[model samples]
Target: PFFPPLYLGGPEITTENCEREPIHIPGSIQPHGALLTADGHSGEVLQVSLNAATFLGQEPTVLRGQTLAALLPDQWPALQTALPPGCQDALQYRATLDWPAAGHLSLTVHRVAELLILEFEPTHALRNAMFALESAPNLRALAEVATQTVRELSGFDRVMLYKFAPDATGEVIAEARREGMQAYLGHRFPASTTPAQARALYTRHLLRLTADTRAAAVPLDPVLNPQTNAPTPLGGAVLRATSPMHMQYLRNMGVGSSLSVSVVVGGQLWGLIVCHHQTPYVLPPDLRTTLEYLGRLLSLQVQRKE
Candidate 1:
């Protein structure tokens, strides 16, 4: 009964919705992660966040007007080929970035608005989660373990394994929650709950997070698409803004923060590992990366259940 209709921009986002809503290119990212944007072709640095230096130990002012290869000389060639064409949705490519001082860093490569976006984390992480996921032998057990693994890794108040149905609606098949929380297991959601475009993007991003429902959203500098002058494509940007309607829904649900990991099966958007938090929280990049990687592993394990 708490579920509400999805509304945005001008109308309700219904199951019949056909227009591509501009929720992806919100042009912002979570502040906790370091961000670097560079030209996709020339590999020249286009934009660097102010916190870049703080994360990688290299000043933004010094990094600007430089090339991506110049920053990770050892990792550049492979990183360049990893960039996928067209930035409508996020395509994740895992890589290790070698820094001059910060040492080797694990990173994800993405294309956002024709620019290469790189987000980094510590070299260590993911092994324990991998071990936790593999210890389970069946899909049921895998979901249970992954759900628990998520609780510890994400620090969320609640976690649910939501599987999509034939009509695109979803149900909670498994769940992991902090003590004293209401369980959502077996609950069903309407087919129109998530819009078409957003669903499509999930298959690409595989991971989405809202650090704080109440935090102000940041916009990309220059504020306009360089060529089209339209909104920049942020579908690939980690800091993309959550739809206002979605934010309102989150607020009403008393969810201070949330994370959704797409469990894609057979190249389709199969389901999501949905996490909710009562207090505003930011996920460590290492932990977030682990969730994404394990989510995919969980997806493969789900297929055997078929």
Candidate 2:
């Protein structure tokens, strides 16, 4: 491969969208879930997804102008109290909901443009599926187990541990895959796969899920944040639209969906535990949370070994 390891140059002009484009504030999400934007102080529903009725069982027209408390009841309070004064970023809560139907719901509440936006999605029961990594005696041994454990629990066709190179490139150091799947072990990709903007976000969120590559992205109500006049950043969005170039790359590689959990060792993007599936896949929030927790543990142990 004659690819350059750097991210800034070479064919930057030719892309599905700009590989370097900032999409964190695309003001959009995938339609697999619903979103509600409300007044934090008044609890008035201000903006609702077009499909809000799907989960709330009321037309978005009806949902709007109404109090969120009417629907969430207890969960609404939990979200309001979860955040500290002046906090702006999202705070996640795993609570059971009674809207549309009852099941595990992962509510991501955040202050966006003076409004509280609550992103909702169906998840599953919680369970920490740790494989006793404390017994591993070596980095290689630990990475091998890490990949396998993530794949089994996340239910993906493939899982890989990619180590970051100084040039910002990545090398696959460990991998796990389903039967008959091609191995990406030892594969190397240039840093361009992750743009500078994405690098900034990867460390913060640590986990990103693309439920389906084929699914379309849902646009935000205002389309642009009335406050910053920029696209509403989905840096914390579970259904955040992925980079088109990256999605195309994955499709070319036969991946239908994927998940990535950042491994930050000492506050740097040390590596990533990336999982891929042959079909569209949506991981339960509890499972994704567990993998993220696992990544943090691995980061600590790996840093020590180095």
Clashes of each: 3, 5
Q: What's the TM-score of every candidate structure?
A: 0.73, 0.86
TM-score of 2: 0.86
Q: What is the lDDT of every predicted structure here? A: 0.72, 0.73
As for candidate 2, its clashing pairs are 24-233, 24-234, 25-231, 25-232, 25-233
How do the residues 1-306 of candidate 1 rate in per-residue lDDT, one tens digit apiece?
A: 112212213455433453345567555555555666677877777666565665678777788778877877866787666665564444567776565375656677777646677776455347777877767777888888888888987778999999898988899998899998998899998765676677888987778878888876644444444445555556665566687667777899899998899988888988899999999987766777678788888887777676
Clashes of 2: 5
Q: What is candidate 2's lDDT per residue for 41-148, written digit by digit as tens?
A: 677886677776666678877887788688678776776787534675645545656444566566767775466777888862123335445456899998998888
Which RMSD values do the candidates have, in order? 5.9, 5.3
Candidate 1: lDDT of 130? 82
Off by over 4 Å in 2: 1-19, 88-90, 102-104, 124-131, 226-230
Look at candidate 2 and tell me the lDDT of residue 9.
33
Worst 10 residues of 1 by lDDT: 1-10
